[PDB]
């Protein structure tokens, strides 16, 4: 009897927590495999904690269902069951020679040795090519050995040196090579100062990002570059490197003209542009380390400001020893201002994000200790914990000692640093206990309440792991905005932007539009920038209409108008071909570099009045670290483009129900060089080709199906 | 529909550990919401 054995398995699971039991489970599990009730068998081993021998009893016809069920349960179970579940599912995948999806789980585990072992064990060169594509998208690089066959192509794929050419191939394919002037975004003719020039420079950088062509800077841009004034003249030059993103040869050619300027602002903006150009792509000759290294100890603080941030963006998520050893002494330098120390913290955190680097942590802690309380009152000091927090991004319980080291620090900076590092350690984990602690922090009303904004941001930074926590945190953010103190509610728009970046869902956009025209100027700026961030790179027509209406409303307010222009530039990022979402591979893999960049921008937005609206708007270029293309290329065995027919539609959960359910709904058929919106999956419409990886995102390699045309 | 009380759609429909975990996450966030609101109202 099926019901009797189900009840027996339930009773066995109940009494295990309280010899023949092993025989009972070893007989029940194959039955559930036979009668297609895989998830009940998975629950059995999950309860009695013997998921080890579940692998031995898996057949070819059911590995996908058990793997998907085990992986989907990880986001909602705490440690140490996360590691056990990931390793069991990875072992099941490896036993079945499904190398790409095993590498996905290894990247989830953040086990570098396991990733290298999976990459090396596979014998299929094409499968290794696809896995190198996933590694390059994730920002993970393996130092392969020379005896490995096809070393050059594998390293080139992992280093993303071909990303720029493929992106330009898309742009030519979608005939969107034409540059867009910021006036095309503003559409001021339909409407019935240095700040606006800086806003237009930022829009010009955002819209034409990674395209390499521009009607306003690739021409004789000295007129436009000098049209800005003072520190805005900093960012415009840096924007010139944003158009040439991922193009470390052409971009550095177009930036070198500005490296000879007698003006410090243009020179350091161009240094930051050189750093931006090298972001993502991993060149072997290290051009960014060659150009920006000589200006990290310059007399001018602007020289250092551009150079350190450029080097951090270029080598973000790399954990390079040479760059870190070159950047660490900048913190303790006497001539380094608190701005330079904060930007050094940001760069060092971005370079060694999620690596728990000992030198970075020790140097940041020493810098924090040496600063006096009056110095710690400076808001740029807030970047020091962030670089520390980025050092331990997603590590979890590895910050306790660091927390102890932070106990001696004086308040209120001690509370701010503690909250920031505690949040960063549990980023993308969904730990409801940590979110409960953050809500406890946000509960107490109060200078004194600086860390409350960080706690509000951290609620989103933890709940971003999966959709259930995301929507629940949306409700929590509504409550915080209703009941919070003004310092509490100035960060809620930033949390909304973080939790739904490049995902312009209607409810969040409406919530931000309600608070866009708010009495408090800071929450208004944050709400407008969050409207820009939420629909960043989506080319949302409705969001563009709201932003144009806001520009009409905020015409007389320079700060609000600047924020509106920034949001408009973000909405049309990369002409709709780029995304800032830190989650890829069906929103299951968290890119530490993207999270680092988003944090660098959003935490700095907690002082939008003095940082973003002041002389430090260049920190917006941290979004470059999070700039990835919403990609779908099908390549042949020799990496040449292969136009194929695919069906693109909103992703549908498959776990649970049996059969072969449709994974997409409301789909349409397009040729493969197409852009995927957030939450949109793509599947091969025909059976002519077999993808190397199940996930049809980024660069995908297709093989000829022998069964087709039998 | 019911506006504020739109809860996320839990999957799968079949009763299993995964659905229990998703529903418990929803319950945890609702409990945290209740605590926060009861603290802020007073």
């Amino acid at each position: 009897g099926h019901e009797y054995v189900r009840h027996l398995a339930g009773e066995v699971a109940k009494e295990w927590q309280e010899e023949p039991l092993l025989t009972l489970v070893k007989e029940i599990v194959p039955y559930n495999m036979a009668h297609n009730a895989e998830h009940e068998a998975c629950d059995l081993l999950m309860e009695i904690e013997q998921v080890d021998m579940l692998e031995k009893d898996i057949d070819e016809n059911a590995y996908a269902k058990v793997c998907l069920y085990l992986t989907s349960c990880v986001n909602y179970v705490p440690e140490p069951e996360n590691s056990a579940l990931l390793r069991c599912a990875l072992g099941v995948f490896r036993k079945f020679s499904r190398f790409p999806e095993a590498l996905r789980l290894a990247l989830m585990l953040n086990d570098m040795e396991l990733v290298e072992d999976i990459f090396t064990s596979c014998k299929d060169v094409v499968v290794q090519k696809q896995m190198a594509f996933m590694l390059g998208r994730h920002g993970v690089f393996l130092e392969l050995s020379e005896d490995v066959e096809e070393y050059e192509d594998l390293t080139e794929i992992m280093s993303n040196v071909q990303l720029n050419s493929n992106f330009l191939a898309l742009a030519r394919e979608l005939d969107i090579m034409e540059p867009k002037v910021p006036d095309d975004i503003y559409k001021t003719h339909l409407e019935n100062s240095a700040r606006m020039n800086l806003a237009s420079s930022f829009v010009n950088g955002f819209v034409n990002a990674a395209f390499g062509q521009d009607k306003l800077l690739t021409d004789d841009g000295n007129k436009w570059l000098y049209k800005n004034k003072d520190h805005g003249m900093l960012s415009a030059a840096a924007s010139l490197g944003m158009i040439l993103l991922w193009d470390v040869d052409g971009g550095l050619t177009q930036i070198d003209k500005y490296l000879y300027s007698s003006e410090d602002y243009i020179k350091s903006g161009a240094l930051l542009a050189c750093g931006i150009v090298n972001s993502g792509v991993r060149n072997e000759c290290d051009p960014a380390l060659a150009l920006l290294s000589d200006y990290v100890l310059h007399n001018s603080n602007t020289m250092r400001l551009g150079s350190i941030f450029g080097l951090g963006l270029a080598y973000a998520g790399s954990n390079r020893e040479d760059v870190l050893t070159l950047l660490l002494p900048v913190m303790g330098d006497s001539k380094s201002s608190m701005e330079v120390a904060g930007v050094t913290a940001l760069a060092c955190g971005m370079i060694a994000v999620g690596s728990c680097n000992g030198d970075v942590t020790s140097t940041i802690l020493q810098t924090i200790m040496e600063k006096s309380e009056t110095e710690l009152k400076d808001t740029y000091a807030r970047w020091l914990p962030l670089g520390l927090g980025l050092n331990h991004l997603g590590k979890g319980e590895a910050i306790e000692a660091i927390l102890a080291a932070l106990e001696v620090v004086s308040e209120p900076f001690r509370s701010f640093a503690n909250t920031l590092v505690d949040v960063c350690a549990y980023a993308g984990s969904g730990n409801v206990l940590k979110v409960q602690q953050l809500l406890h922090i946000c509960s107490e009303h109060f200078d004194m309440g600086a860390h409350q904004g960080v706690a509000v941001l951290g609620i989103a930074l933890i709940a971003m792991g999966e959709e259930i926590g995301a929507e629940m945190a949306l409700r929590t953010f509504g409550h915080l905005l209703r009941y919070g103190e003004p310092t509490l509610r100035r960060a809620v728009p930033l949390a909304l932007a973080l939790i739904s970046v490049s995902n312009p869902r209607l409810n969040i956009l409406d919530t931000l539009s309600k608070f866009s025209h708010d009495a408090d100027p800071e929450v208004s700026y944050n709400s407008i920038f969050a409207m820009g961030m939420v629909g960043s790179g989506t080319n949302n027509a409705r969001l563009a209409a709201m932003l144009r209406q806001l520009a009409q409303y905020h015409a007389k307010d320079p700060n609000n108008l600047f924020m509106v222009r920034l949001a408009q530039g973000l909405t049309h990022l990369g002409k709709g071909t780029l995304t800032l979402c830190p989650y890829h591979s069906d929103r299951q893999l968290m890119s530490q570099v993207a999270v680092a960049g988003l944090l660098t921008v959003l935490v700095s937005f907690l002082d939008v009045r003095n940082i973003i609206l002041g002389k430090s708007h260049y920190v917006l270029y941290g979004l470059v670290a999070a700039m990835q293309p919403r990609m779908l290329v099908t390549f042949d065995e020799e990496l040449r483009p292969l136009p194929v027919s695919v069906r693109v539609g909103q992703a549908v959960d498959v776990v649970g129900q049996a059969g072969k359910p449709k994974t997409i709904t409301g789909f349409q058929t397009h040729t493969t060089p197409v852009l995927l919106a957030h939450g949109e999956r793509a599947e091969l419409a025909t059976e002519e080709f077999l993808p190397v990886t199940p996930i049809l995102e980024g660069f995908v390699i297709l093989r000829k199906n022998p069964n087709y045309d039998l | 529909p019911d506006a504020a009380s739109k809860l996320p759609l839990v999957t799968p429909h079949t009763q299993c550990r995964l659905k229990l975990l998703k529903l418990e996450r929803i319950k945890d966030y609702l409990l945290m919401e209740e605590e926060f609101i009861r603290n802020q109202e007073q």
């Binding site: 189900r6 409550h479 | 809860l7 009763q15 529903l23 319950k27 409990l31 919401e33």
Partner: peptide
């Protein structure tokens, strides 16, 4: 259906908590 009683209890708790949230926050 080993979690049927647990799922039912959690769903009832969810509904009670949601009703309490609506009562405290107003929305009527």
């Amino acid at each position: 259906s080993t979690y049927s009683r647990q799922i039912k209890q959690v769903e009832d708790d969810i509904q009670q908590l949601l009703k309490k949230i609506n009562e405290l926050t107003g929305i009527k």
